[PDB]
Design a binder for these strands. Structure first.
Lengths: 161, 161, 161, 161, 161, 161, 161
DNA sequence: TTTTTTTTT
DNA sequence: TTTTTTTTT
DNA sequence: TTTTTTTTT
DNA sequence: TTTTTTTTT
DNA sequence: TTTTTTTTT
DNA sequence: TTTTTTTTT
DNA sequence: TTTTTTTTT
DNA sequence: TTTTTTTTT
DNA sequence: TTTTTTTTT
């Protein structure tokens, strides 16, 4: 069964939602189990249309990888990072859409700006959702992401009984 | 059932793979359970033959102990460590093979070099696999290794229901 | 009567013009006066076509709000800020055009770069005008903007005779 | 005769190639020689399609000017710069295409990120190639660019025999 | 044949041009070659009449000596120097014209001011051309001047084949 | 014609020799010229048999690449680097021989230790030549290597006449 | 043909002259070329007899070696060095003449003192020429010496066409 | 003898 | 047009 | 008893 | 394949 | 008397 | 042309 | 909907 | 394909 | 006139 327990932050111009997507496994003929498709921490961004109302139809997704999560949780208060993704990588229609996620601290040190840029050369679109993240909110993510990290890696299968 | 969920890092001249090996337990006649063989975090190194293709036949293994993992996760950005192992320790043919694993930070501080040296006085061989590890990648290990530590120790058996 | 006294800075690839737009007031039936539409400090950017000649047809506007002006005048030499606007906010055709104004100090500390990015998903356009601003020129703005701040707020109506 | 000796750096998502383009000279009627068209250090970027294979058809070029090279070679480890170009400057169809090249140090100080953004308002395209440059690789450029600087300026014509 | 490849910087009130003048040599009767007249790095300054148009008729020249170039290239960002010349030195009409070239860093550290003062007691004139020089532009000079230094000294004649 | 002008340093237990190996070029059918095989700075090490006499028969070679030279010349007094090579890389008999060159500063700061380790799993040999390099001697290399860098890259073909 | 392009500094009690002496080569029977006699940067000192007139008959020479030049160019403003030479080294009449060249910074940091001591136990003479060298003058040497270094080493023979 | 490879003209 | 001069081969 | 609300599957 | 060993229930 | 010029309404 | 909205007199 | 790929049991 | 332009001999 | 020597092709 699917599970919907998003950690969501709602703000001025956009909302930010984060929830883990588990790995898929293939049961070998040997009898063992082998991790197939990798888990991620899925990020969802969507725009605020009107006053404290958001347009879920206009959402964009960004899939944090094991490493990227590893990079996010280890950031100092002064650090910043930026990830670049091609949704249709290695496939017939690559280079067409380009996503970038950036985490920069703000001046005050009262947290970060997390923004998702999406450039689409097929539909000729340019989207950008930025959400402010307090120290407290980002602490939730770091702790929740750390917790989730071994699971998206499939390391929660290694258990004594 | 066996489980295959390796955290793997692929790089220039070698690849590095890490996955936990659980402890074995013996069920006492008393009724209780006693930890027998200890768990480890197994490290696998193997060479890159050709372009982004690796020779799995030429792999070497190194078994991180509870303590060694404890040493690895507590390293500062400036720290370095080195472990020495004899695969055939206390056995009939010891001193013949000698493994050493070293973790040194690189100049930049952009992570570490993790190399596995293997000297074999029987086969008269000398092998060395070095893999670069970004801050993000090493953060995955620290978090994944911390998670795994209580399990390889068998402490995950201590649970309320 | 309208008044045209722009503070303008002309430079390599673009020109920058700044002038206040007063608030509108509605005369209450009570007899008093009530501020209706808010004042702004209007910014105009336009491109340099040819040698020291500029294409006024290609201008883009950005309306500084009371707060944003407040943010601009209080910047240290090392500080930087960025504002995001949707011209057609809360209206039928929002999210389509997106403006961002950024003020970053340059390396030397010899002032700032003020750039106006305009992304238009209807016309499928992407515009960007950057103008260098010396310490002296930015001092004009800070002082002129401070002077203008109470007026765009309508606080100049509070006067003893 | 033309000469093809590119210094090239191949990386994850794009490759970076640098080679000098000499100045052109016009032989005066006086008998002397006069530099006509200026030399540049040409930069080529192109995308990685598939695994360690790159799409040369999708390349973009950026022409470093004497001054820009001068700016690049004098950068400290902590410095960053950004250049803006209009391929069709002063011509009938300007403002349509806009290139920007940025050199920012990365966190670690293990070099820089060199990225080339290309926005095309005619074809309605938005391209961006980023390549990581180690300290060693950037040292090659600085030294190679310094060497090349007097030549693209035409100063190698001033020689005693 | 003469060669015209000036490095030129154009600015508000004046332009600055720099190009090497090679040494002259006298072929000894012994068969060898002897450096006669010394090389210099010639500097040309001229005024801006009208808008981005300059009056080449009003130019003044200043001849950098081996040593002076040596002094210029070794300047720190905070350093400043000043050279004094008498065009008609040791000749019948000396003390009449007096040139001084000064290089002072500007406040910001965004480069230097290079000005050429010319006082002429015969024509009763006093001229002064000041040009601002960015870090990048001055880096061109330092590198170009270093390159040129051995040539104006005639050291480029010392070559193995 | 071949040219033999080695910069050589002779010391206690080994000697160190450095000389550039130019790139090879292929003359295109187009008429142009294309760099084929890359240039290197070749390093030769050999042992001292007896008193100030060396065994040239026991030499080992290490080919510095453009990048590696770039890395060497940019080293601070406190920096250290290490390069790893497989003579028979991508060929039928790879992984068999492994060379490593290390440059570590010595305690005093009176220069560096440059050592070449060679492990040969076919002949079952392990060789190591270490040579001390004063600040002055290493300054020769840095300057000589910088000079040589553009040539091994083939950038000396880009010349105005 | 011989070439005479000395960089000379004239001062109170002595003058200092510096010019490169190229290496000699022997053309092998193999067809190649082999560096025979090494190049040097020759230093000449001579006394000032009378007022700004110098006694060229009383000159003394000192031959800078590749390494010594390497040592000279890498000196900090605070550093000092001293070289010792025996003109008739390894020959029948050694130990008789002893030259020493010293470069010490002066108090102010306004350059260095370069002095050449010559003790001759055959003629029973003791000579000493000291010349002051401004920062600018020493900058000429460093740059001119760096330029000359690859040539006296014979590395200028390694050229692509 | 030499760490290779990626993309053109 | 250009700050010169000092000492050789 | 508990600060709520915003958007899906 | 894996550095082991020490002491219980 | 005053360093000017660039683009509108 | 311009990021809006919230609460009075 | 989601940046992929490399090597086993 | 490439940001241009300004001033000579 | 010049600090030399070490090892090849």
């Amino acid at each position: 069964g699917r599970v919907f327990a998003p950690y969501s932050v709602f703000k001025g111009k956009a909302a930010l939602s984060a929830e883990p997507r588990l790995p898929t496994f293939n049961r070998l003929d040997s009898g063992g189990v082998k991790l197939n498709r990798r888990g991620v921490i899925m990020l969802t961004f969507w725009p605020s249309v009107g006053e404290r109302k958001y347009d879920w139809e206009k959402r964009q997704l960004f899939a944090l990888s094991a490493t990227e999560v590893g990079s996010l949780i280890s950031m100092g208060t002064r650090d910043s990072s930026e990830f670049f993704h091609d949704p249709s990588m290695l496939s017939s229609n690559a280079g067409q859409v380009r996503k970038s996620l950036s985490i920069k601290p703000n001046a005050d040190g009262s947290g970060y700006f997390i923004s998702l840029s999406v450039v689409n050369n097929n539909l000729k679109t340019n989207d950008r959702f930025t959400v402010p993240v307090t120290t407290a909110e980002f602490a939730v993510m770091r702790t929740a992401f750390s917790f989730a990290l071994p699971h998206i890696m499939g390391w929660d299968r290694f258990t004594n009984r």
